[PDB]
Each structure stands twice: as structure tokens, then as C-alpha cells.
Design a protein around this nucleic acid. Sequence first.
RNA 1: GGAAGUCGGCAAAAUAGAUGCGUAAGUUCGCAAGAAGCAUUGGCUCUGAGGGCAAAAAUUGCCAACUCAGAACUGCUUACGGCGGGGAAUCCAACUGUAUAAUU
RNA 2: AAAGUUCACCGAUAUUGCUUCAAUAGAGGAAGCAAAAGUCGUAACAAGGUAGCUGUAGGUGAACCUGCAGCUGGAUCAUUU
RNA 3: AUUUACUGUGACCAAAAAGAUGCGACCAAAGCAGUCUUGCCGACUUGAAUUACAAAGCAUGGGAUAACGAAGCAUCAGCCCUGGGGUUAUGUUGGUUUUAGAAGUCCUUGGGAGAUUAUGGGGCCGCGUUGUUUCGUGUGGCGCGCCGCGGCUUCCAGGAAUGAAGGAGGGUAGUUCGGGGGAGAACGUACUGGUGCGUCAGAGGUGAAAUUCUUAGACCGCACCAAGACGAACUACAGCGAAGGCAUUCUUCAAGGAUACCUUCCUCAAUCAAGAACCAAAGUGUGGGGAUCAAAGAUGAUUAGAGACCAUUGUAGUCCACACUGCAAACCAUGACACCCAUGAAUUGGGGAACAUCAUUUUAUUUAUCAAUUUACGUGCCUACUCAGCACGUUUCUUACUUCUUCACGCGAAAGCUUGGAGGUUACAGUCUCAGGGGGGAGUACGUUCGCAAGAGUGAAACUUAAAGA
RNA 4: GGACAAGUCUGGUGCCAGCACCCGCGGUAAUUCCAGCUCCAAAAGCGUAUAUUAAUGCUGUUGCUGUUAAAGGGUUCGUAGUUGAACUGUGGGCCACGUAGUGUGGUGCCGUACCAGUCCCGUCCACCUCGACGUGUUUUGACCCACGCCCUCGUGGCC
RNA 5: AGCCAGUGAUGGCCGUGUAGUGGACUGCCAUGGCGUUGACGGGAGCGGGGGAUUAGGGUUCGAUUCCGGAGAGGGAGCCUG
RNA 6: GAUCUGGUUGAUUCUGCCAGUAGUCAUAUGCUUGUUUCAAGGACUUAGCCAUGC
Lengths: 129, 140, 150
Amino acid sequence: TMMSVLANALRCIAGAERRGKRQVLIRPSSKVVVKFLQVMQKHGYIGEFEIVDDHRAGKIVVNLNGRLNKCGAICPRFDCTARDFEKWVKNILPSRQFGFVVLTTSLGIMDHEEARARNTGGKVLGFFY
Amino acid sequence: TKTNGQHAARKLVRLRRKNRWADKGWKKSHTFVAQKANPFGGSSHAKGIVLEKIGVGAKQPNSAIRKCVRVQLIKNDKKIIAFVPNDGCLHFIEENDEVLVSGFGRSGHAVGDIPGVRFKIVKVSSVGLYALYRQKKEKP
Amino acid sequence: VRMHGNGHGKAASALPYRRTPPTWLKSSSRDVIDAVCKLAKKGLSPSRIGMQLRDSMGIAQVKNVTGRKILRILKHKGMAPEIPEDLYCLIKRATQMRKHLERNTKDKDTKFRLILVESRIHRLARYYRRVKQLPPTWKYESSTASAMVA
RNA sequence: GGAAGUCGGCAAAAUAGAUGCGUAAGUUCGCAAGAAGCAUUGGCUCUGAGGGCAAAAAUUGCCAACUCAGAACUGCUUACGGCGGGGAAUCCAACUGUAUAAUU
RNA sequence: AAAGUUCACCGAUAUUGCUUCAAUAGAGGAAGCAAAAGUCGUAACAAGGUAGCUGUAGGUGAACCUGCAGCUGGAUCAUUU
RNA sequence: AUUUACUGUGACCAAAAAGAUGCGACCAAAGCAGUCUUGCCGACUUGAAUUACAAAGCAUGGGAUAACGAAGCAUCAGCCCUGGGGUUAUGUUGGUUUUAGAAGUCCUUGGGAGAUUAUGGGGCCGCGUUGUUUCGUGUGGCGCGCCGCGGCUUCCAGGAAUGAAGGAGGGUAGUUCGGGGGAGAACGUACUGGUGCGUCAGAGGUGAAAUUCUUAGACCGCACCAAGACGAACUACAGCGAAGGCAUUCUUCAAGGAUACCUUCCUCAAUCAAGAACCAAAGUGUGGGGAUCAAAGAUGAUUAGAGACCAUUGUAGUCCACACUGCAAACCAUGACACCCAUGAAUUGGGGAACAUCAUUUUAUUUAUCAAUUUACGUGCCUACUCAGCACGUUUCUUACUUCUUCACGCGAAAGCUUGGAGGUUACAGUCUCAGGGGGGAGUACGUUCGCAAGAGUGAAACUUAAAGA
RNA sequence: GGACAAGUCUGGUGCCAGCACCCGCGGUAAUUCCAGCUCCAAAAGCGUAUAUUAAUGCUGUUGCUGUUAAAGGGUUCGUAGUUGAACUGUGGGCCACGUAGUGUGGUGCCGUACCAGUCCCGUCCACCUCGACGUGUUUUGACCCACGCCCUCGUGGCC
RNA sequence: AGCCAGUGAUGGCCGUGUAGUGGACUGCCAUGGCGUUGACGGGAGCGGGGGAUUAGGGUUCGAUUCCGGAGAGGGAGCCUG
RNA sequence: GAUCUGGUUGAUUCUGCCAGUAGUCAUAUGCUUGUUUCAAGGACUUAGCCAUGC
Ligand SMILES: [K+]
Ligand SMILES: [K+]
Ligand SMILES: [K+]
Ligand SMILES: [K+]
Ligand SMILES: [K+]
Ligand SMILES: [K+]
Ligand SMILES: [K+]
Ligand SMILES: [K+]
Ligand SMILES: [K+]
Ligand SMILES: [K+]
Ligand SMILES: [K+]
Ligand SMILES: [K+]
Ligand SMILES: [K+]
Ligand SMILES: [Mg+2]
Ligand SMILES: [Mg+2]
Ligand SMILES: [Mg+2]
Ligand SMILES: [Mg+2]
Ligand SMILES: [Mg+2]
Ligand SMILES: [Mg+2]
Ligand SMILES: [Mg+2]
Ligand SMILES: [Mg+2]
Ligand SMILES: [Mg+2]
Ligand SMILES: [Mg+2]
Ligand SMILES: [Mg+2]
Ligand SMILES: [Mg+2]
Ligand SMILES: [Mg+2]
Ligand SMILES: [Mg+2]
Ligand SMILES: [Mg+2]
Ligand SMILES: [Mg+2]
Ligand SMILES: [Mg+2]
Ligand SMILES: [Mg+2]
Ligand SMILES: [Mg+2]
Ligand SMILES: [Mg+2]
Ligand SMILES: [Mg+2]
Ligand SMILES: [Mg+2]
Ligand SMILES: [Mg+2]
Ligand SMILES: [Mg+2]
Ligand SMILES: [Mg+2]
Ligand SMILES: [Mg+2]
Ligand SMILES: [Mg+2]
Ligand SMILES: [Mg+2]
Ligand SMILES: [Mg+2]
Ligand SMILES: [Mg+2]
Ligand SMILES: [Mg+2]
Ligand SMILES: [Mg+2]
Ligand SMILES: [Mg+2]
Ligand SMILES: [Mg+2]
Ligand SMILES: [Mg+2]
Ligand SMILES: [Mg+2]
Ligand SMILES: [Mg+2]
Ligand SMILES: [Mg+2]
Ligand SMILES: [Mg+2]
Ligand SMILES: [Mg+2]
Ligand SMILES: [Mg+2]
Ligand SMILES: [Mg+2]
Ligand SMILES: [Mg+2]
Ligand SMILES: [Mg+2]
Ligand SMILES: [Mg+2]
Ligand SMILES: [Mg+2]
Ligand SMILES: [Mg+2]
Ligand SMILES: [Mg+2]
Ligand code: NA
Ligand code: NA
Ligand code: NA
Ligand code: NA
Ligand code: NA
Ligand code: NA
Ligand code: NA
Ligand code: NA
Ligand code: NA
């Protein structure tokens, strides 16, 4: 059965961008999925997306602009101390010049660059570049 | 394909413990069985008495007589066969002499075309075999 | 996939997005409650009450009018079944199979199916004991279960 | 002293009741088994447990029978009768039974 | 207040018996691995000259043979429209 | 009543050793020293500051989680006020006795609330049965309006609950679908053996023969009888089953999947050490049965030989009932669950459209960036009834076994795989579980569990090899 | 000789003696043995044996493999264990001013294009002249970021 | 793959003994205590601060200077303090 | 220093091991050894046995 909604959604987006599609449909939706997409959109990696209501878990349609190379989830959600950001950047990112690691902290869901500014650790959710 | 569970530490620990017995290198160093079968008691050298001078034929592609010796170890009274290196060098060894024996280079494995030999003579009468060969010393 | 098989069946009903009853119904909430209690007196299960209302009296859902589910209505009126309906229907099927096996002792196919049904029963009973719908220390036994069933 | 006797341990010696602990190979899983083996046992003075019948009832009163389990003190000359010696193997017959009254 | 008497308790040591572990002799019967270019055949590799192989049962100097069910890793991806 | 994990910041933590600031011991490994204004001295000389798992302890933060509780009629008491009822302090200690409070406990006035309408039941019965609002002053649209009544009474809480997962379970229906399973009764030819007639000299078998049967009538022809097994052609890159497996007809018994549904319920789930049930053929035990074929055995050939291949026989077995065994190239040599995934022809079951049967949006003169309706279409059979039926043609949908020789990425050492992955993986993390670590010795020895046995499960080492393998 | 830096030099031996961690060399012309001469490495140091760490992603949590190379249980059920769908919710005003996307209306509007008229050719394919819509400006206004202030910071209820 | 109970095994009551708590020990009472989250048994071994090898994660050593424990051939008992 | 090379074929691409390589206050043995500073030193086997002096 399906055990992770976030992992399912990120696999659908990465698969569609590999095939050069313009839109992708994601089902089911969740609060964590929407927050993850808002971080990607703020940095300019996807574009506009829309949520459709069906009185159950919703559906999401995402528009892709072709700037996203790969996104993925990290399972299980390992803890990350504020001094451990460099270790994760070295392991799962193409370089130290671009790309983001997404964390869930007591201040909310954010990328690793913002978390370093606020000096907070948390649990690693995923990445995109 | 393995667990990847976040609360499955016990399963991963048990898996590695069972599967670590499947490599000969790890098993040999942890089993105490090869040590008992080893004529040396886990040491690098041993001393013994010469019983007989024998000639061992080389393996099939080669053709020679290898000029080995039969030695009984002092520490536990085990009998082994040891190679005597270098040209001549069998004239320096007599019966009932005391020799120092070391291994070959492969940790209990036979080397070269000599069939079942894994030891070589290093000292005789406590002088040094290679030193005798180069004439730097005289046999006492 | 099915719990105890290899089938991938998708047949099911799809509830509508709009939950308000249609304007031509003209049936009060009190009238629906009365019709539900009458059928239960006749001796019908909650599943059969809903189909009878849907097929003849034009009520698509008993929750959209009266705001209550069928089994909740019966519990309030004190006419709820002693054991859950889905559990009862499984026990009845196992009883019929055992009766057939008494005369036919070479039916290895039926013996296999009896194993699956009894496994389903024990899983169902475990859930109902946890949510306190069955009394604790309630057990299914093949000898006793012939009673208390159709 | 301990089978050196003798065809041959023949004959004799020897074990022995009860209680507690413990018990091998083999096996048709029932047995083998009391396998093998170790300890206690007297007398005297005490203590506890094990029940019935009555009554205006975790109470009171009255009463019978002989088992079991303990303690202190004290003693031995090992002291009636009765009562398996044990173990490791080979051959034959599966077993209980019958059968040359008067040599098998 | 010394020697000395009796009892209780702690208990070395010795003997006997069980249990457990570690090394060890043995007539004979087998197995494996090597050497020597020994004797008998030719089972496999081609349709290897009876297609081969798996499971099982019996037989025979040796490889092997035979019966029953299976497989293609076959020597056929194929012939009442 | 709120708690842990996590995370930020600080407390509590021997030295030596390890990381580090400073100082030209001639440099360095070191050490904690040393420097100079030429000193009856000075630098208030220096010797800084770190890390040390896991557990424990203080005070922030609340996103991801986890421990609790509950399973929803096992429930729900609405607040504030005024008028009634029925321990102190008396100068101190020790005693009797009271007046009041407060509390509870019944009546009553004042006020404002309510998350779910005092109007729900009877009977006592009697009577009769043109005003806004659009839209171009005006037109045109506008929506609302333009057993019945009756007084009384008693009983009554019965409507406030996230939603129903393209997760699981249950229900109803076509008495749907199929070599799915268990029971009876029958049917069909054929092999073998008999019986009755006819005829007369060979028949059988092979590469060629021989073993074998035959004037005491074999082989052949017709008719019939007995017994046991088996269900040809139709039969397919078809169906059903968890796998092993399943093929004549009719009558019965209990099941199973798919489809349809505005039925019910509300996380009940996925995978799994231990544990259980089933499991081809051969094989074993006890009774039946015994036609065919046929391990063992016999005879004839062939051959240098032939314990084989070929021929004629022939026992166990092959079949049924009840018990065992659990060893397969038990194979898709490919574990289960879940997501995404390009193309054209076909096919098996169900449903919708069609056929047949019944019944009788604005707009829009000057538009367009991802359309507001591609929904079209006929045939054959059919009462002088398993039938409002049965097939075909056309377009959609859910489930299943597949193909491309006119199938795309991608992947792989290659052969090849490809919605059904061996793809979406060094750009390496969806969940669980079982195996492997050079070739042999070897699935062998020893020990132990199971078995009547045959065997099955668990399972080493000493030695020996430079390759074995794809 | 190669891995591995450095001789196709000169004598001796002739599958012998010997070398060789591995591949291999030696039967008459040995780049490998025994020696001479040259040359190489690192050096007051340099070989050999045994154990251990790295080489080793050949123990794999990071991070292995399982169609054919070693490796998926004969099939289902199933306990301990591991893993488990969505939801209660992150506010609004007031200025300012460089942005700041969009709709709705203002303001003028050379040239181009479109629609509607007039005339004209053709009947199978062409042109003229006007009363408006567009396109392009320029402001408004709603989204957006930066900076200040305020809010009983949903509604209600006081004031 | 089960361990523990005559003769203390888990707990209770009144005591004794100790410098002091306590099944530490005497008497009586109940049937408990531990275990696949690996008890019971077996093998190697003094524990730590630390050493070696350093992309990171890891693997391996620690008789030996400092801290703690134990012993004085084996094993038992004791006086003085 | 986040590094690899030789061996299976008539040639090719793999799996996989054997061999090579660097360190060790890590032990032992062989050859050699001019100067200086700093240092471990009967643990491994036998918690084996001890003359003599302190
Ligand atoms: K006996
Ligand atoms: K008898
Ligand atoms: K053959
Ligand atoms: K051949
Ligand atoms: K066979
Ligand atoms: K049989
Ligand atoms: K035959
Ligand atoms: K198997
Ligand atoms: K079908
Ligand atoms: K020469
Ligand atoms: K590997
Ligand atoms: K006490
Ligand atoms: K003193
Ligand atoms: Mg399951
Ligand atoms: Mg005698
Ligand atoms: Mg005599
Ligand atoms: Mg006698
Ligand atoms: Mg026994
Ligand atoms: Mg006895
Ligand atoms: Mg007898
Ligand atoms: Mg007798
Ligand atoms: Mg007689
Ligand atoms: Mg042929
Ligand atoms: Mg052949
Ligand atoms: Mg052949
Ligand atoms: Mg054969
Ligand atoms: Mg220091
Ligand atoms: Mg549901
Ligand atoms: Mg006939
Ligand atoms: Mg047929
Ligand atoms: Mg059979
Ligand atoms: Mg029989
Ligand atoms: Mg057979
Ligand atoms: Mg034949
Ligand atoms: Mg025959
Ligand atoms: Mg049969
Ligand atoms: Mg397999
Ligand atoms: Mg591959
Ligand atoms: Mg592969
Ligand atoms: Mg991976
Ligand atoms: Mg191996
Ligand atoms: Mg047995
Ligand atoms: Mg038998
Ligand atoms: Mg076996
Ligand atoms: Mg060279
Ligand atoms: Mg070179
Ligand atoms: Mg070497
Ligand atoms: Mg030469
Ligand atoms: Mg290593
Ligand atoms: Mg590495
Ligand atoms: Mg394989
Ligand atoms: Mg399989
Ligand atoms: Mg969740
Ligand atoms: Mg020790
Ligand atoms: Mg130490
Ligand atoms: Mg030691
Ligand atoms: Mg030292
Ligand atoms: Mg010392
Ligand atoms: Mg001491
Ligand atoms: Mg000593
Ligand atoms: Mg060739
Ligand atoms: Na046959
Ligand atoms: Na197959
Ligand atoms: Na395909
Ligand atoms: Na490694
Ligand atoms: Na240690
Ligand atoms: Na100490
Ligand atoms: Na090969
Ligand atoms: Na000097
Ligand atoms: Na000097």
C-alpha cells in the first residue's frame, strides 16, 4: 500500500520533467505537499499550480517551466543539527553553488539556507535542484 | 534489498552478524581452528631438529629437484618439510642440526612449483644461512 | 488487491459532490426516521434498509436528509443488532460450509476456502474487541456458532 | 590372602524392609528400571496439620480415630523374625503357555 | 588467671562417585585429493551416432541402462480462417 | 490536568594524550617558558581558549513523529440576583446555653443567554364534508405576492454528528461466467478375452530375420456377451484454480472471481521469524480390482563383446477406498504490496450507447493563445418457447491471458527487457521479507528433530586448487 | 622481462644447477640462473617472516548482488517484529514609493489593419471614398516586494 | 530453549546478626520471579582515559606510566589495630 | 591521495578471486653502521622455580 504521500508526489513530478511534459497531475494532496511546492515555486523552479476540491484528499495540477532537473524525498526523515548542513550538501547536492535541501523545523518548512540564517535544525524532508 | 526502517536497528545488526561468517578472511581470524592446525603456534618463526634430507620433484611444467629437509619442531614435536634456498646451501646442513624455520610468503599456502612446502630454512646452528652463502661467516 | 486473493476489482459506488437533497423530495426528516424504524421492525439489516429506501421512496442518502447515519438511528431507538452485521454474515457462511463438509470429506477445495473465511472472522473480531463493540472475552467456535445464526 | 580350587564360583558366603535424592546404552516409545548409586532409621519429652454433632454463627460448647511432618535431650556391643547380589557381552527361541508319571 | 573437657559454627585436605570439557592408541572397512602419459571400454560435446537434462524406483564390470511424471537450457517461436 | 522524541541556548563534567594562542630553547622532535629601559628592578609578566559518545539534569520553539483517551443516547446539570421556609468575639482558663452565618434541601419572585423552531401526540368534541431589480424616458426580461376550522386538557430530550481514501471488509442483482471442487445415474468407440456361424493355409514381427500362434481350424468376416481403463477429431500463443492441477451427458451440494450500485461501515491495513494446511510422478501399509502398457526377470536378434538400443513376453506397478511420505528443469530458472509510463492490430467475461420492446448560454458588425457539446451507424433467425430473445456490424468503459514480423524513451557485459520492466539508480533513500560472497572436498561427516521404510530438515572442517564460470 | 625505476653488453651452465610473492625463465644466441662491467631506487640505513589497518562499493547504514555468472522459499494462511491514507491553521487595515502582474474604466490617438456603407468589375479567382472597432500612448485600480503605524488580531458585546 | 524452590527460589510478619540496610540469617505464610527485546549454558578477555589507519562513515588494538579492581605457590582461618 | 596495476580467450566485453602496493611507540631475525638529542626495555610461553646481597 501507499506509505508516503510526499514521496509519491515528488516521484510524479520528477518523472514528468524527465519526459519533458508541460503539466502533471498529482493525487492525493496534503498539507506537507503544498508547503514543499511553495518552497520550489518561490525560488522559481515550477510555476503556477492549482488545487481541485473533491471533499476527499484533493488533487493538484502543476505547470512545469523546464528548469527543474531532479527532486526527491529522503526516507526516513533523519534529524539534522544546525552544524550538519554542510554534510548533507556535500552528499546529495550537485555543488555548493545552487540547489536546496528542505527541512521541517519548529519554525515551519524551509530550505537549508533560510534555516542557517535563523539558526534552527530539524528533520530532512527532501531536495531539489 | 534490506529494511531501511528508522526503528529497525536490531534487524540490521542481526543481519550483519549472520552474514559476516561467509567470507574466509573474517572467519579465519575469528575461529581459533586454523591456529590449532598451524604447526607454528601463531608465531612467525620456530626452531627444530633436522631428521632427513629429501628431494622434492617440481610440478609438471617445470623439471627439477628442490632439495628440501624434514624437521621436527622443538615446541610441540610436529614434523614439517622446509625448503633450503640458494645454490648449494645443502652442504651447510647436517642431520641432528638445529635450524630456525620461517614461513614462505603466503601465510600457510604453498608457493611456487614445490608441491606442498610452505616453510623455509633461515638459520642453522645460529649463524645465518644467507650469511654462510655469501661467505661472511663460518659455520661454528 | 483483495485481502485473501489475487483479484484486482474496482467496482464501487461514487458519492456525489453536492450533498443537498433535491427540491422534489418533499419528505420531512421525521418521515424518513419513521420509515427506517418500520423496516427494522420487519427484520431487515442496515444495508437492506438503505437499498429499500433508495429503490422505492426516492431517498438517495439518509445522511443528507436527517443528518444521521442509518446505524446511528437504530442505536438511538434501541433496535441495533446484537453483533455487527458484517461479522454476522461471515459466521453464517462458515456454518453452511461446515454442514456441507460433514457429508463430503473429500472436498479439499472447500476446506481451503473455510480456512480463509475463518481467518477473516478472527481478524474482524480482534478489531471489534478493541473498539469495544463486542464484549471482551468473546470467541468464535465452530461448535457453538451453529446457533445464533440463520 | 581372596577362585591360586575345579571341566565349570558346584556349594557356601553375599544383597535385602521403608523414606528422601538420583538413574546409562538400546528401543517396537510401552519399556529397559528396584537399572547403577548416596544418605537416614533407637529411646524419651514436646509442637503443628488433617474432622463430626448441636445450638439465636469467620461464634460458642461437646466429642471420636490414627496417620503425616517437625524440635530439644539422650544412647549404641550396628544386636528377633521376614526380606532382590549387580554389571559388560556372544549363541538360540519373539513373548505367556505345553511337554518324555519313575535318569533328558 | 594457664593447661585441659563438652557442644555449635567456619572450614583446608584426602578418598569415592557423578557431570562436563580438551587432547589421544586401534586390527579392519570406506571417502577425498594428487602422481606416473598403466589396463578395459567410450558416457558427454555435432541429431556425438538411442536428443539432452530434473525428480523417483529397479538393475548391471565401468562409465551407465530401463520404467513413470516433468522441462527446453531443442534438433520446432510456423500451416482445417 | 499534559508528556516524550526532535531542535536552539546554557549548566555539570581529572590530568596526561588529541586539536589550538603566544615565546627564534642556534632549527626541529620538545618545553611552559621567558623579555629588557642594564636593573639592590620593571612588565599590576605569562601560562589563552577547545572536543570528548550514550544516559541524566535547566529553561526556549511546536513543524514531523510517538505515548495516552474515546468508539460517539454508557449523552446531555445552562448564568446572575431577593424573599421565604424547615470557628471566632463576650477580661483569662474550665464547663452549660444560645444569636447568626455558611452549607446542603424544598418553594418563589428580577433579569439577561442557549449549537439547533414552546406549535409534537391524542381526546372532550361541534360544524360542514403592483413592488423591487436587470436591460437597452421607454421597451424587454424580473421574482415575490395578487378530513378543513375551531376552545380545553394531559404526556414528550430525542437533530448537531470532519469526510467516506481510484485502502480493506460486508450487502443486493443478472438464479450472470468458467475443462474450478465433492457426490450419484447413464453414454461412446477401441484394446483384451469368450460364444455362434463361414472359409481354408498360413498369421505375426523386422533394416533382414528369429523367439511365437496354427487342419485339435490360427489370421480374416458378421452378430453378440464380460470386465477394467480412457473421453479422439472440435482443442486455440483460449478458460478456471493459491500452487500442485482441471476436458462425454444429465441430476444434485456447497463455494469463487469480475461487473453494476446516490446500499452499509469507518482504518478495521502491507509484509512476515515461530507455527498450520495443501502439494506432480515414483515409493510405502491394509483391503478391492486387474483390460492395456510395463521397472525386475525370460527368450530371439545385433555386435569384437552387448548385462543396451530392435522384437516376443512378463511380475510389481498403472485404477478405487482409507492412511503415510513432503525429495521435481515444483521454471516466467524473474518474492509480495503501492505510484508513473509511448504506439497499432487482436481475444475472454461484465456493463453503457446503439438495435429491439414499451410509453407519448448569451450570442455574434469589428471573432480566435489551447473552444460551449466531434456521441455517427445498420443486418440475419424468430411459438402454424430455459425468448420483451439469440448472434453480427459501429463507438466508449472496468477485469484478465497476450502479440507487433509496420512497438517509443530508458536500461543492460551482452543475449535481451519494456503499461505485464530486467525502466523511472553514483542525479545511488516508497514498505517488508528470503538468499549469496573464487572453484572443489559437499549438501559429504558428526550431533539432533521428523518418518514404517525409502528418506526429509539443520549443517562443518582438515586438506587441495589459479582459475572455474557468463 | 612485466606489474615497477634501471642493459636488445660480455663469459659459464644446458629442463641440470638454480630463479620466481604472481605471470613465468632454464634442452647450445638465457633481456630472468652463476659471475664481470655499467645502470636504478633510498640511504646510516636496507631486506625477510607473522599479525593488523588502508587498498576492498570483496560485509555495502552512507553503499553491493540475486533471468542466464553464487544467490527468490513449491503454494497459501499466519503470530512476534518492522511499516502504515486525508482533515481542525498561519489574519486584516492605513499611509507613504521604487518596483509590481492583471482587469476595468478615463485621456488624446500620425501611420497600419479590421467591420459597416457608396460605386465599380466578375459570375471560378478584382478594385475606389467614408462612420465606428482596434493596435500603440498616458494616467487610474487591483496583485507583488521592500518600511513604518494600528487592530477585542473572525463575529458579537462594551465605549 | 527453557532457568530458579529438599538445603532461599520471588514476596509478607515478628525477630537475630552487622558499624549500618537487606532472604544476610532462624521460624511461620503465599506461589511467585526471569526468558526469542535471546534468559540458562559455552568460548575469548582485568575495565576506562586512550593508540594505529584518516574524504566521510568505519575497522582494529589497549598485559604496560594516570584512575578503579584483584592477588602475593594453592586454597582456608585469624589476632592487633 | 576521495587514484590503482598483473593472471582465464585465437581475439572481445564481464563476474570473481589470487598476486602486487603503503603504514604500524609491532614483534622477531639477516647484512651494515662516523657524530649528536630524546626514549621503550622477561607482558605474550611457565600467577614456572629461586643461591646471594639489599
Ligand atoms: K540392563
Ligand atoms: K505367567
Ligand atoms: K546417453
Ligand atoms: K562421441
Ligand atoms: K530415468
Ligand atoms: K500401493
Ligand atoms: K517391453
Ligand atoms: K527444491
Ligand atoms: K473470462
Ligand atoms: K651461451
Ligand atoms: K559483489
Ligand atoms: K526486618
Ligand atoms: K593505630
Ligand atoms: Mg496478506
Ligand atoms: Mg583356575
Ligand atoms: Mg589347577
Ligand atoms: Mg549356587
Ligand atoms: Mg536414555
Ligand atoms: Mg534402589
Ligand atoms: Mg520359548
Ligand atoms: Mg515360560
Ligand atoms: Mg523323567
Ligand atoms: Mg535419431
Ligand atoms: Mg557417445
Ligand atoms: Mg547420445
Ligand atoms: Mg538412460
Ligand atoms: Mg597536552
Ligand atoms: Mg470506504
Ligand atoms: Mg474380439
Ligand atoms: Mg469428446
Ligand atoms: Mg502415485
Ligand atoms: Mg495390493
Ligand atoms: Mg517403477
Ligand atoms: Mg524394445
Ligand atoms: Mg506386451
Ligand atoms: Mg492409484
Ligand atoms: Mg529456485
Ligand atoms: Mg547485469
Ligand atoms: Mg541483472
Ligand atoms: Mg541504493
Ligand atoms: Mg565459496
Ligand atoms: Mg526414530
Ligand atoms: Mg516398508
Ligand atoms: Mg539429509
Ligand atoms: Mg628484469
Ligand atoms: Mg621500465
Ligand atoms: Mg613480498
Ligand atoms: Mg648470455
Ligand atoms: Mg581491510
Ligand atoms: Mg573506499
Ligand atoms: Mg545460477
Ligand atoms: Mg518461485
Ligand atoms: Mg500520516
Ligand atoms: Mg586472563
Ligand atoms: Mg589496561
Ligand atoms: Mg596474559
Ligand atoms: Mg611500554
Ligand atoms: Mg613490566
Ligand atoms: Mg591483598
Ligand atoms: Mg611464583
Ligand atoms: Mg588458435
Ligand atoms: Na507404461
Ligand atoms: Na520452464
Ligand atoms: Na508491448
Ligand atoms: Na571494506
Ligand atoms: Na580488551
Ligand atoms: Na589499583
Ligand atoms: Na572461462
Ligand atoms: Na662532538
Ligand atoms: Na663525543
